[PDB]
Design a protein around this nucleic acid. Structure first.
Ligand SMILES: [Mg+2]
Ligand SMILES: [Mg+2]
Ligand SMILES: [Mg+2]
Ligand SMILES: [Zn+2]
Lengths: 128, 125, 136, 37
RNA sequence: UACUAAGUGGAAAAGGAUGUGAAAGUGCUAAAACAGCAAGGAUGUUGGCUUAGAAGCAGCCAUCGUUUAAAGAGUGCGUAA
């Protein structure tokens, strides 16, 4: 099992895979085939590295707290937790939650709601 | 303390009194990611997987005026899988998952005021 | 180096450290304190070593008090000098610590750092130290 | 082995024992063997 | 009647130590104690600045939250990371 970082538009390289015996050249088409709906965005892949050779792969969502920056209309958050700069309402928070529900292992949607507050507290954005 | 233990035994005894199906499982070699997956695949309030204490389960069983389950809860690792209304689909789901697992034991449970054996659990799915 | 700004008399008689505890007996500014179990003469050099030790092992918000002060001076005749021809010149300043005087106290940081801080302060001093807390 | 007048554990794995009426410190790391406690 | 296992007695300090005896309190325990053994020990994610890079284990912005029995922005080792 390997959590490897590959660009969505450029995933053909990577020597580490070759150490396990994965058929890299046959599988390059599979890597590129199902990521064209999210071109440009960086999308890592989880690989079920094993000796069966029928390596099932799963894509993964871009890491969180960059859409928090986008919604806060600021490039980089405050360098002090006490200092509050960005403000985010519940509507922008809920759009992020339903977007990020795919990668999250929470059963309910309110659990995903309070994930946005949790990363925003780390980011320093007041939850209004 | 003792009062919390008394409260705990009372409520679990009430839950198993108002329930209709129970099955016991072990906690040998399955991941927490897999544990969250089982919770989401069930997604039914009637179906509930829980880690119970072996001692607390027997004492709640004494208060439930049932018999014969004692052999299950002796020198073993115990899970509780309570099902409300329909339990066949819950048993079918858990059976499919253990087949998807690597290794697993499976200990006798309780349903419909009757008890079963290991092979009887194999056919209850 | 703690030192009195001026003194009326350069060469005073030495002050005994034998006896019980006159003042500075109970923690009254902080709430943990470094008590002594053996009266001895300790000089301003040991205070500065102990104070610097506490400050280095302190945090960003801890606060400390220094109770004892080296009021009394001591002299030392120059080497290779035969007895006579008056008393020697003052050399070093010493604080008189009796059995039971609280030397250092600390507050406003968790207990473990304070216990450790008092330990490093007491290893710099000749007296046999002991930890005490403040009465409620 | 380090011979010191005072011996104390260096890492949480160091364990104090008393062998041949002498207290020593043994540990997985051989740089932390102490004696003459 | 107790104590010492050091020939202490029959010379010594700062400091160090699961030597041993006595006493006074406090926590859990046959609704199971402690050690050990057998299992799991998570997700967002590898959070984000930051750093060539750190993303469980460089300094940080701090020192998140759910599922859940439990899980830590991790316990270390360790990986350029
Ligand atoms: Mg002798
Ligand atoms: Mg001892
Ligand atoms: Mg004793
Ligand atoms: Zn060690």
């Amino acid at each position: 099992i390997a959590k490897i970082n590959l660009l969505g538009g450029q995933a053909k390289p990577g020597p580490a895979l070759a150490s396990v015996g994965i058929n890299m050249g046959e599988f390059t088409k599979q890597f590129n085939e199902k990521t064209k709906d999210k071109q440009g965005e960086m999308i890592p892949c989880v690989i079920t590295a094993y000796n069966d050779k029928s390596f099932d792969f799963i894509l993964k969502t871009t890491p969180v707290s960059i859409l928090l920056k986008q919604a806060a209309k600021l490039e980089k958050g405050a360098k002090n937790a006490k200092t509050i700069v960005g403000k985010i309402t519940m509507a922008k928070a809920k759009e992020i939650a339903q977007y990020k529900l795919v990668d999250l292992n929470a059963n309910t949607v309110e659990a995903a709601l309070k994930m946005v507050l949790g990363t925003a507290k780390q980011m320093g954005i007041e939850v209004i | 303390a003792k009062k919390d233990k008394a409260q705990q035994v009372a409520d679990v005894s009430h839950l198993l009194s108002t329930s209709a199906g129970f099955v016991i499982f072990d906690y040998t070699s399955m991941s927490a990611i897999e544990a969250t997956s089982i919770r989401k695949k069930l997604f039914k309030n009637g179906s509930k997987i829980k880690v119970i204490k072996n001692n607390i389960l027997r004492r709640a069983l004494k208060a439930g005026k049932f018999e014969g389950i004692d052999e299950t809860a002796i020198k073993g690792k115990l899970a509780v899988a309570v099902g409300v209304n329909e339990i066949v689909e819950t048993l079918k789901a858990v059976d499919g998952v253990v087949k998807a697992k690597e290794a697993m034991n499976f200990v006798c449970g309780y349903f419909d005021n009757r008890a079963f054996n290991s092979a009887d659990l194999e056919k209850i799915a | 180096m703690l030192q009195p700004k001026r003194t009326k008399y350069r060469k005073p008689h030495n002050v005994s450290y034998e006896g019980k505890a006159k003042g500075n007996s109970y923690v009254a500014f902080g709430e943990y304190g470094l008590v002594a179990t053996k009266g001895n003469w300790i000089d301003a050099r040991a205070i500065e070593s102990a104070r610097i030790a506490i400050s280095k092992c302190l945090g960003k918000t801890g606060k400390m008090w220094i109770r004892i002060f080296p009021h009394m001076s001591k002299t030392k005749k120059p080497l290779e000098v035969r007895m006579g021809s008056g008393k020697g010149n003052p050399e070093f300043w010493v604080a008189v610590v009796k059995q039971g005087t609280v030397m250092f106290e600390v507050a406003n940081i968790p207990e473990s750092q304070m216990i450790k801080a008092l330990t490093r302060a007491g290893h710099k001093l000749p007296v046999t130290w002991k930890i005490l807390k403040r009465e409620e | 082995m380090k011979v010191r007048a005072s011996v104390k554990p260096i890492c949480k794995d160091c364990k104090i024992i008393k062998r041949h009426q002498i207290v020593r410190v043994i540990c997985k790391t051989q740089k932390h063997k102490q004696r003459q406690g």
